[PDB]
Amino acid sequence: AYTNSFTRGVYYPDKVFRSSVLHSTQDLFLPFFSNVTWFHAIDNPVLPFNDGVYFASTEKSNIIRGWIFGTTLDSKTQSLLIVNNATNVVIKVCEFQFCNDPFLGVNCTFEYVSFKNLREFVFKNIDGYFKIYSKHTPINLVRDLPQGFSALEPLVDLPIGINITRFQTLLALHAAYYVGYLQPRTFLLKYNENGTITDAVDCALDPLSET
Amino acid sequence: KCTLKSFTVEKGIYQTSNFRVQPTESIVRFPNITNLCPFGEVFNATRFASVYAWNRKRISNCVADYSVLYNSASFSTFKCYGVSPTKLNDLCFTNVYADSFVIRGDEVRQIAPGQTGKIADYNYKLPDDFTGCVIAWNSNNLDSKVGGNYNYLFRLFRKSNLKPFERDISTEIYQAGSTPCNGVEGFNCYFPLQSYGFQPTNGVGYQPYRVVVLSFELLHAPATVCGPKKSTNLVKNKCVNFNFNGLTGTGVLTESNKKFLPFQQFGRDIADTTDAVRDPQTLEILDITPCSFGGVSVITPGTNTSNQVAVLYQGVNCTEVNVFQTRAGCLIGAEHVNNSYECDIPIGAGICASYQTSQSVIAYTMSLGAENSVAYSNNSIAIPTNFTISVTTEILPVSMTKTSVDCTMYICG
Amino acid sequence: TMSLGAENSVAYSNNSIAIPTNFTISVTTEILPVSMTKTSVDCTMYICGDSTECSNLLLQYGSFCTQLNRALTGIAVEQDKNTQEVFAQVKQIYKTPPIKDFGGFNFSQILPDPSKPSKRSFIEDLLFNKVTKFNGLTVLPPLLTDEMIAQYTSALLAGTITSGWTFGAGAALQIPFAMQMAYRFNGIGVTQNVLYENQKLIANQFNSAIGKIQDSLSSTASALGKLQDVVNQNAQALNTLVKQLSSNFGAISSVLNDILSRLDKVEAEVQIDRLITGRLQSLQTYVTQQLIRAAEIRASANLAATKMSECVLGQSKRVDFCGKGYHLMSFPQSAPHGVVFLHVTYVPAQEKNFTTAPAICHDGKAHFPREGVFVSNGTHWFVTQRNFYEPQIITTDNTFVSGNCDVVIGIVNNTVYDP
Amino acid sequence: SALGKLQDVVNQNAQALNTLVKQLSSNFGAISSVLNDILSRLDKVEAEVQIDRLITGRLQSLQTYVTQQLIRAAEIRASANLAATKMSECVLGQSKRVDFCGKGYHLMSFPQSAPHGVVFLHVTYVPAQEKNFTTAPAICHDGKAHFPREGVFVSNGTHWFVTQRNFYEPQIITTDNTFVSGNCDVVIGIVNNTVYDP
Ligand SMILES: *[C@@H]1O[C@H](CO)[C@@H](O)[C@H](O)[C@H]1NC(C)=O
Ligand SMILES: *[C@@H]1O[C@H](CO)[C@@H](O)[C@H](O)[C@H]1NC(C)=O
Ligand SMILES: *[C@@H]1O[C@H](CO)[C@@H](O)[C@H](O)[C@H]1NC(C)=O
Ligand SMILES: *[C@@H]1O[C@H](CO)[C@@H](O)[C@H](O)[C@H]1NC(C)=O
Ligand SMILES: *[C@@H]1O[C@H](CO)[C@@H](O)[C@H](O)[C@H]1NC(C)=O
Ligand SMILES: *[C@@H]1O[C@H](CO)[C@@H](O)[C@H](O)[C@H]1NC(C)=O
Ligand SMILES: *[C@@H]1O[C@H](CO)[C@@H](O)[C@H](O)[C@H]1NC(C)=O
Ligand SMILES: *[C@@H]1O[C@H](CO)[C@@H](O)[C@H](O)[C@H]1NC(C)=O
Ligand SMILES: *[C@@H]1O[C@H](CO)[C@@H](O)[C@H](O)[C@H]1NC(C)=O
Ligand SMILES: *[C@@H]1O[C@H](CO)[C@@H](O)[C@H](O)[C@H]1NC(C)=O
Ligand SMILES: *[C@@H]1O[C@H](CO)[C@@H](O)[C@H](O)[C@H]1NC(C)=O
Ligand SMILES: *[C@@H]1O[C@H](CO)[C@@H](O)[C@H](O)[C@H]1NC(C)=O
């Protein structure tokens, strides 16, 4: 299955305040109108990670609750495991072994701890640092990933030093989710009077956006 | 006189060196954290890693006295990149990552940005814009043994080179060619790791050396590691010299309405100059405004006629500096006049100055000329009954001095 | 493929002339830049940001910084001279009488309104609405305030209305405005009675042409494009100079206080010298392009000063100088960094074709018109003024003889009356 | 005080050459600003670095001089094109252009040479002793409107005269100094005087 990504998945590029200004930046971003892959859990395979991932879910009862990242995912080498329920988060890079069907029932060189709704996330890996950005918003459209703009804000940055080429989501059992891949892109970002990134241009989308 | 390189001064207005308000006080605001960083658990540690599997220690939430490191005789090398060790005591960082391992004394030169070779490519790669220090010392009295200390290893083979801070503990047999290796050694099929086997009799390049590399998380993010420094009271609405988390400057700090999102520590202008900050102890957003400045113009009749003088502080308000406020700036030594006259020396924003009656420099709103109601009506004409021949002189430039520069003789003598 | 315009076969023959039977009074707005914002960049504080360390490295370069301040100061003093040469062409501040007895012409939109905090005209209030600091950069005020510029445009305009051109050549001599316009008609070769006989029409054509200026200026945001372009060029130049503070030029940072708070002096000097070299080159690029741009604004201020003298203080014979059509008159209106001329021009507008012959035979003598053209309706021959169809009976008072009938290529046999 | 236009051309070119000469004494970041001093203290491997800073700075200093002389030459050329136009229009001619050749109505001009320039002695007619009169755009004779051929109608208070515009010279109003056009009733401000028949 497939759908249009629209303008989703912009995130705050740096921890600097700016206002009433059109800042231009190059980074790993989800391109505008990119071809988003769509999955229905009510459906969590291993997937390539490429240059990083945008991930999102339309939400009503919080069914989607974690992720795996790494290469062979079979205890021969390390894997970054992330497990979440919004009150708590658990993260480790151990040489884990995984089953036929990774799900949640309702050398660890690093370890770390902490429809009605649309949840958006971005995952990227640069110079051994692994980074996560986030957003949540109420919605009324049940059908599909909504047209409109709202930027993702940073949460987590981990100095793990470990290679990633594949990833997989984790599901709760006694709901649908989206995937798109980031690319190296240049974006023009509209910081408003309150420092909200209210709008953007993907400079490589079309000749008008390049203008 | 000195500005003009001259003993005469002609009638005019002359911009002498500019005015700046000076900072009244110097201010410092670091985080109010109380821990002291665990560097003894690094530099006085019993063990150091095999270089193929270097350790990393996060330093955070603590005071770091780097002078305990660089004042110590214990270290044989202390290179620093993007920083000098002397200045680390005055800086602040989000985190510091201390990376550590054992190598033989010859390999220390591969532990730098821009390097290549087995260590730099297969064991530990620094980013070329590494801001940080490389600290190293001989340990042949600690890390060496009769018959050889084999306990420290390095990676001799990998199929691809490491990216910056990429780490890889894989034990797989290195396949050099067409020969199928399948996890056993043979021709073209080699085990990836080797020992140094340190013996006390080794020459200095083959002796064991300990290494620590300090990598600074130097960012717009809030700090958690900071140098040993006092923090002052905070001053507002008055020009001060300041330091927030090692960002030095000079300006009028004020309270502000800038709606910083919780992750943001600074706000930047078009020039990348910081024009708001968050105080690291009490989380208020302060606007930063430049300390007041402007030109100083000296207003004078010519030295052929008088030596009394007036001064304009351009754009300045007289509270910041006879004294007289104008739209052009604070005007000093001029007599403000209620009359108006033609413009002798132009001050700006409708103001002019002249030397007048017992005499002094006056300053006034300029007169555009006499006001005149022309005696118009639908039937009134004026016709001139007599004339005058004028002979008005006009002067025009036509040429300038022809010059030629032999640029070879000028540049090279 | 672009069109150069509509095609036109001009209906030429050795005997066909078109004479225009009616006119339109055009008012055509011309906009000119006259000045630009008097910037001044403290090159020590731009390059070095109140660092003592950088400020002393900048003394290695000698007088590069003082000749940059000298260049921007000469640009700034020229902008007051550019403004003085355009508007200060009037020696006394003339003012209009209390009663507007101007023969039906209605200047209320271009003369001052007393109610405003600066007494601009209504059209000057439209012009001022349509046209739109910390890194050692400063802006100096102009010598003349916008209220003094409006007193000069009011004095120029009150002299122009009450006295004709005479306030340029001597003291202002009063003259009734409908009599001044009858001189402006002689100045374009239209016999002055054409104005008095069409006076109420001409006054309404002028007043409606002024009404189209209000509607155009109120509605159409692109109207003042030249002044807005000059404002945008100077804003873009400063935003370029300011963003060039954030460039590294090969230093470790573009923030001069990072360099001084991280490096010891022996290394800091090497990195600061890359910033000095690049910022000095950036400021030399800014000042060189502002000298080239000031030379273009000075060329436009010298043109605006020449249109003030020749169009406002005079009436111009120069084709297309004071608007399109034959120039009658012009009025200056102040605008941000510029001047606007409301060029009033006579345009002929309703041609008739006629037969024409260069000379006339009577008693074997060749007659030529003293002032006018010979023309015929098809059977009767009339001498006519050359820019407005008024046929007059051909008579020994409106014609002069030279030679006999034999010499002239196109002469026609006719009667000529003798008074 | 008048000659400040030509004396400023001399002063600007003296200031430009003195700036170019004093800029030889600047280090530009070399050990010295004396080229022979570098070459008499250093061996060539060291000296080439120090000399290249003097070359870089003297080259930039000379490029700055030549660029400001190009911009100043364009400013003097505009003034030479203006002086060549005042020579043609006002020495070789009489200009109808208002305030082109002195304030007042231009009669004539004379060129005098001066250092790096020209001085024009613009001779101009200025009217000097105004007097007020009553005026009217036309005169109603035999029900004909009359208008002046050249000049203006005025009255001393009781009698009507025509004059040229720029010098009071009252002439009796006659069919030689006036032309007819139509009936009186069209004209805003016509007056019921006589007109004489010569
Ligand atoms: C996504 O890609 C497929 C081909 O793999 C194409 O048929 C489909 O139309 C694309 N959808 C969008 C939203 O572009
Ligand atoms: C969240 O998960 C943790 C284990 O990861 C568990 O201890 C905790 O009780 C859970 N809380 C909720 C609200 O589900
Ligand atoms: C951890 O790594 C070591 C080598 O460093 C290896 O011998 C060991 O088998 C690994 N641990 C597990 C649980 O396999
Ligand atoms: C900025 O935020 C305030 C609330 O903090 C809000 O009232 C205001 O409308 C916002 N402005 C804009 C342009 O959204
Ligand atoms: C740190 O700052 C807070 C104010 O934000 C204050 O309440 C607290 O007592 C301070 N702690 C120390 C150790 O100074
Ligand atoms: C200038 O000063 C001298 C004396 O130094 C004096 O003789 C001369 O008259 C003065 N000239 C003017 C124009 O004031
Ligand atoms: C000058 O500064 C004082 C504050 O020091 C302020 O009260 C006053 O309004 C200012 N006046 C002007 C004209 O800037
Ligand atoms: C200026 O004139 C006003 C009265 O119009 C008077 O109050 C004021 O004191 C005068 N100031 C000076 C400096 O003469
Ligand atoms: C004049 O006559 C010619 C006859 O061919 C015609 O083409 C032209 O349009 C006429 N022009 C006017 C103004 O009547
Ligand atoms: C004018 O031209 C016509 C032909 O177009 C010709 O018949 C006639 O003779 C010419 N007249 C003169 C005076 O040349
Ligand atoms: C003309 O007459 C008016 C009458 O009010 C008078 O004000 C004006 O000064 C007179 N002008 C001349 C030049 O006589
Ligand atoms: C001139 O104006 C007055 C009122 O100011 C009026 O009474 C008179 O009739 C007018 N005369 C002419 C000739 O328009």
Author numbering:
A (entry chain B): 27 to 68, 80 to 143, 165 to 172, 186 to 245, 263 to 299
B (entry chain A): 300 to 620, 641 to 676, 689 to 744
C (entry chain B): 696 to 827, 854 to 1140
D (entry chain A): 943 to 1140
Article passage:
Changes in the spike (S) glycoprotein in these variants are under scrutiny because the S protein has a central role in engaging the angiotensin-converting enzyme 2 (ACE2) receptor to mediate cellular entry and is a dominant target of neutralizing antibodies (nAbs) elicited by either vaccination or natural infection. The prefusion SARS-CoV-2 S trimer is composed of S1 and S2 subunits separated by a furin cleavage site. The S1 subunit contains the N-terminal domain (NTD), ACE2 receptor binding domain (RBD), and two subdomains (SD1 and SD2). The RBD transitions between a “closed” (“down”) receptor-inaccessible conformation and an “open” (“up”) conformation that allows binding to the ACE2 receptor.
Spillover of SARS-CoV-2 from humans to minks, and then from minks to humans, was first reported in April 2020 in the Netherlands and subsequently independently reported in Denmark, Spain, Italy, the United States, Sweden, and Greece. To understand how these affect spike conformations, we determined cryo-EM structures of S-GSAS-D614G-ΔFV (“ΔFV spike”), which included all but the TM M1229I substitution. The 3-RBD-down states were ~43% of the total population, with the rest of the particles constituting “open” states, including ~47% 1-RBD-up, ~7.5% 2-RBD-up, and ~2.3% of the M1 spike. Thus, we observed a modest decrease in the 3-RBD-down state from ~56% that we had reported for the D614G spike, and the appearance of open states (2-RBD-up and M1) that were not observed for the S-GSAS-D614G dataset. Upon closer examination, we noted unusual variability in the S2 subunit of the ΔFV 3-RBD-down structures. The variation in the S2 region was unexpected because the S2 subunit had appeared relatively invariant in prior studies. The I692V substitution occurs in SD2, where small changes can translate to large movements in the NTD and RBD regions. Structural analysis revealed destabilization of the 3-RBD-down state and loss of tight regulation of its conformation in the mink-associated ΔFV spike. The triple mutant and B.1.351 spike structures, as well as ΔFV 3D-1 and 3D-2, clustered with D614G spike structures; the B.1.1.7 and ΔFV 3D-3 structures clustered with u1S2q; and ΔFV 3D-4 differed markedly from all others. We can infer from these structures that in the virion-associated spike these changes could have an impact on spike stability, possibly leading to premature S1 shedding.
